From Swiss-Prot, chain A:
A GO cellular component entry from the record: chloroplast
PANTHER family cross-referenced by the UniProt entry: RIBOSOMAL PROTEIN S7
Main location: plastid
SUPFAM superfamilies cross-referenced by the UniProt entry: Ribosomal protein S7
Subunit structure: Component of the chloroplast small ribosomal subunit (SSU). Mature 70S chloroplast ribosomes of higher plants consist of a small (30S) and a large (50S) subunit. The 30S small subunit contains 1 molecule of ribosomal RNA (16S rRNA) and 24 different proteins. The 50S large subunit contains 3 rRNA molecules (23S, 5S and 4.5S rRNA) and 33 different proteins.
Native organism taxonomy: Eukaryota, Viridiplantae, Streptophyta, Embryophyta, Tracheophyta
Gene: rps7-A
Name the record gives this protein: Small ribosomal subunit protein uS7cz/uS7cy
Keyword annotations from UniProtKB, A to Z: Chloroplast, Plastid, Ribonucleoprotein, Ribosomal protein, RNA-binding, rRNA-binding
Pfam families: Ribosomal_S7 (PF00177)
GO molecular function, one term: mRNA binding
Curated annotation (Swiss-Prot), chain B:
Subunit field text: Binds to the mRNA channel of the chloroplast small ribosomal subunit and interacts with 16S sRNA nucleotides at the A-site and P-site.
Family: Belongs to the HPF/YfiA ribosome-associated protein family. Long plastid HPF subfamily.
Name by which UniProt lists this protein: Ribosome-binding factor PSRP1, chloroplastic
Cell compartments where the protein resides: Plastid, Chloroplast stroma
Species for this entry: Spinacia oleracea (Spinach)
Residues forming coiled coils: none
Residues represented out of the complete protein: 70 to 177 of 302
Function according to Swiss-Prot or TrEMBL: Ribosome-binding factor involved in light- and temperature-dependent control of protein synthesis. Interacts with 16S sRNA nucleotides at the A-site and P-site, where it protects the decoding center and inhibits translation by preventing tRNA binding. Stabilizes 70S ribosomes against dissociation. May be recycled by the combined action of ribosome-recycling factor (RRF) and EF-G.
Originating gene: PSRP1
UniProtKB/Swiss-Prot annotation, chain C:
InterPro entries: Ribosomal_uS11, Ribosomal_uS11_bac-type, Ribosomal_uS11_CS, Ribosomal_uS11_sf
Coiled coil segments of this chain: none
Originating organism: Spinacia oleracea (Spinach)
Major localization class: plastid
N-terminal signal peptide: none
Record gene name: rps11
Name of the protein in question: Small ribosomal subunit protein uS11c
Curated annotation (Swiss-Prot), chain D:
Gene that encodes it: rps21
Described function: Component of the chloroplast ribosome (chloro-ribosome), a dedicated translation machinery responsible for the synthesis of chloroplast genome-encoded proteins, including proteins of the transcription and translation machinery and components of the photosynthetic apparatus.
Stretch forming the signal peptide: none
Record text on subunit structure and interactions: Component of the chloroplast small ribosomal subunit (SSU). Mature 70S chloroplast ribosomes of higher plants consist of a small (30S) and a large (50S) subunit. The 30S small subunit contains 1 molecule of ribosomal RNA (16S rRNA) and 24 different proteins. The 50S large subunit contains 3 rRNA molecules (23S, 5S and 4.5S rRNA) and 33 different proteins. bS21c binds directly to 16S ribosomal RNA.
Organism: Spinacia oleracea
Similarity section: Belongs to the bacterial ribosomal protein bS21 family.
Subcellular location: Plastid, Chloroplast
Cystine pairings recorded for this chain: none
Protein name in the entry: Small ribosomal subunit protein bS21c
Taxonomy, superkingdom: Eukaryota
RNA sequence: ACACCAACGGCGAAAGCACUCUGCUGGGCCGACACUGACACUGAGAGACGAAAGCUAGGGGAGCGAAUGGGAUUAGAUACCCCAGUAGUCCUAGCCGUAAACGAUGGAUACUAGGCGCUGUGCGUAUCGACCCGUGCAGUGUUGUAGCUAACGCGUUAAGUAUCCCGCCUGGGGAGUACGUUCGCAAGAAUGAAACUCAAAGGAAUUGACGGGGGCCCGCACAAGCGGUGGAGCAUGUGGUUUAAUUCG
């Protein structure tokens, strides 16, 4: 098949941001869009309560520390499987960034999803927790095999 | 398939199955795919008979053996012979070539 | 130490599955050698252009006690380890006078062994 | 210096393909006609 | 053992022959009439040579490398892969006499379109000297008319048209085996059946299918996501088991 028709991406409902709307679509599970909306804006009203900066700043600065520049694509030549790394694009790194961020945010227990996404989000903002460690363990594997190409 | 092997499933159509029949099935099929080291999931051996003194047509014994293996696909072999025993030995030979096709194609 | 002269030959035994980056003076007393098996990883990984780059870098990074200006490189043999090694020496950028090949070009001397049939 | 490679470029004058030729066995005119027919037609 | 030179190139009867130089020596091709005057062709049996592997005798032994030995892959591996590695490979003197020893085409003469080539010489042009053009022949190659051929193709180097000479063939197995004999140090080579059995065995071409042969292009086919089944409980269907029947498909 050739290609996908280009893209249509709208901005955030109340902040007019194309990243946070991407994040509210990724936290969506089966159509409950008002509830995912609720979880994200309770996370923003939580992040105004924790520190006192723009949530765009702590969010974008968080996902800069989750986004990888390179990853493992276990490719094949002649039947021989090389673990050769290939440089991932930018918006691909956005989708992977909030991917690991969100799934890792679905592990830290204790309280509702606002506290869970808040806690793993500031752990991304401080280089701790699990999402940026997941960045490292997917980053120190492609670093480990640069002897391929 | 006495032990450790793929799961055996018989089908008997138009045929009252005996001890010597399914014993010959597990011993010829199972003991010829006993030098396997294959974790094949499921073997369906469907052993129907037809014709001759039973009905119109020549005397036929027709076996189909199907292997739902993990190892690169599914395979089936249908042979039609004058006896049950010649059917099951002949399908046993065919499935020997098909499994050596699978194992030998895993190379390098 | 050594004779302390900043000109000296570099030999790169680029094998079909390995590389060796040795460096020696004009007479031929080696001042350092470092190969793909030297720099850590070993096996099917060694003998790739990353191993040529890392083995050359860890080879000539230890001649900073000399600080050789006038470099000249005398490589040998077939393999995927040549061009990354020359990009490594030009990355260190020291006064590479001339690179050259000294590979054994036989004049039908000995019979090379059986073809592989794999 | 610049990142130009004239050793590879000059190398194909007398290629290192006389060393991938000489790893495997001395064999007669079947594979010397295959390699030297494909090589007599690669230069023409 | 002799890279580049190495060429769809040169020579030999074939096998073969390539680092250079020297010596002895074979054979080919071309011209002049310089000579003889049919001395010609083929060749049973015979004789010689005859790749490689093999064997006797003595040297020599770096690489490679049957057998062997170890490691690996593998259910297994006496094999492909890898590491060692003996005979052998080379030479002297012999024996052996077989090869897909193939151009899968015995030799010789005469005759029958061309195109594009290469090699060797000869004549004329051109210059006066290397070229360069046509050619006279001989040899080597590639497309190709006629004709032949079951077809593919061959086609002045015929598988064409004719003439001569020798060999060999008459269904496939059995079987290049048995027996005998000759040769051979042996390995074996040569000559070479039958009983019985089969209705085929073969050749060239076509159409399909297929290929762990290419080339190209689609498909939620894989990859990227998202969500499940397989785990638990239940609903239901099938197989098996049981029963008088667990209707049949």
């Amino acid at each position: 098949r050739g290609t996908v028709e280009e893209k249509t991406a709208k901005s955030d409902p109340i902040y007019r941001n194309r990243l946070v709307n991407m994040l509210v679509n990724r936290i969506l599970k089966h159509g409950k869009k008002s509830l995912a909306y609720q979880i994200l804006y309770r996370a923003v009203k939580k992040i105004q309560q924790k520190t006192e900066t723009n949530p765009l700043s702590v969010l974008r600065q968080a996902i800069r520390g989750v986004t990888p520049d390179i990853a493992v694509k276990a490719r094949r030549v002649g039947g021989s499987t090389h673990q050769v790394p290939i440089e991932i694009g930018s918006t691909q790194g956005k989708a992977l960034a909030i991917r690991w961020l969100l799934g890792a945010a679905r592990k830290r227990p204790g309280r509702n999803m606002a506290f869970k996404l808040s806690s793993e989000l500031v752990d991304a903002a401080k280089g701790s927790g699990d999402a940026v460690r997941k960045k490292e363990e997917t980053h120190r594997m492609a670093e480990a095999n640069r002897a391929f190409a | 398939g006495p032990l450790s092997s793929v799961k055996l499933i018989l089908q008997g159509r138009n045929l009252e199955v005996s001890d010597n029949v399914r014993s010959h099935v597990e011993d010829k099929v199972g003991k010829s795919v006993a030098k396997h080291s294959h974790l094949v999931r499921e073997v369906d051996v469907r052993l129907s008979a037809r014709g001759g003194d039973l009905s119109k047509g020549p005397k036929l014994r027709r076996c189909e053996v199907t292997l739902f293996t993990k190892r690169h696909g599914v395979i089936r072999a249908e042979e039609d012979a004058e006896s049950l025993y010649s059917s099951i030995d002949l399908v046993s030979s065919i499935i020997q070539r098909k499994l050596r096709k699978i194992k030998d194609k895993v190379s390098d | 130490s050594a004779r302390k002269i900043p000109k000296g030959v570099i030999h790169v035994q680029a094998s079909f599955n390995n590389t060796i980056v040795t460096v020696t003076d004009v007479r031929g007393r080696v001042v350092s050698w470092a190969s793909a098996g030297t720099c850590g990883f070993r096996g099917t990984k060694r003998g790739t252009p990353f191993a040529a780059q890392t083995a050359a870098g860890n080879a000539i990074r230890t001649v900073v006690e000399q600080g050789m200006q006038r470099a000249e490189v005398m490589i040998k043999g077939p393999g995927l380890g040549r061009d990354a090694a020359l990009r490594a020496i030009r990355r260190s950028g020291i006064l590479l006078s001339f690179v050259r090949d000294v590979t054994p070009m036989p004049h039908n001397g000995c019979r090379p062994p059986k073809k592989r049939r794999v | 210096n610049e990142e130009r490679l004239l050793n590879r470029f000059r190398r194909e004058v007398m290629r290192a393909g006389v060393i991938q030729e000489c790893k495997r066995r001395r064999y007669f005119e079947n594979k010397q006609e295959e390699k030297k027919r494909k090589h007599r037609e690669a230069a023409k």
